[PDB]
Amino acid sequence: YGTHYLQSGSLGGEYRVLFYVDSEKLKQNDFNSVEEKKCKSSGWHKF
Amino acid sequence: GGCSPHYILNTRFRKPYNVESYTPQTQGKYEFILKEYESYSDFERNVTEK
Ligand SMILES: *[C@@H]1O[C@H](CO)[C@@H](O[C@@H]2O[C@H](CO)[C@@H](O)[C@H](O)[C@H]2NC(C)=O)[C@H](O)[C@H]1NC(C)=O
């Protein structure tokens, strides 16, 4: 039977809402390009 | 015996001798959890010798 009895009070209804949203987005692009050449020429006059 | 008036809404009930109370203590708890996760990773190379 518990510890107390109700001497007075109100009756009715309780309505509660908790609603939570958490979005994260990440996009990352890394690009690297390397171009190298050598050229050489030798000759005299015939070679 | 018994035959004390017990009502729920307009419907009146006869309580069993054994039962101390049967009472409409209405309550409701909803719970919704949605977790979506994505990962993508891309790797390329292009390499040439002449
Ligand atoms: C490797 O080379 C290919 C071909 O050039 C690259 O794909 C091309 O990229 C260009 C520019 O983005 C587009 O216009 C072409 O339509 C693509 N063609 C094809 C078949 O994919 C590709 O991006 C290069 N990758 C690296 C890492 O250098």
User: Cβ(B24)–Cβ(B32) under 8 Å?
Assistant: no
Distance A30 CA to ligand 1 centre (A): 15
CB atoms within 10 A of CB B6: 15
SS3 A30: coil
Distance A31 CA to ligand 1 centre (A): 12
User: Cβ(B23)–Cβ(B15) under 8 Å?
Assistant: no
Q: Which two tokens stand for residue A4?
A: 């107390």
Q: What's the rounded Cα separation, in Å, for the pair B11 and A31?
A: 76
Bridge-based pairing of strands B6-8 and B11-13 is antiparallel
Q: What's the rounded Cα separation, in Å, for the pair B13 and B5?
A: 7
User: Cβ(B5)–Cβ(B11) under 8 Å?
Assistant: no
Q: What is the resolution of this structure in A?
A: 3.3
Q: Which two tokens stand for residue A35?
A: 């171009």
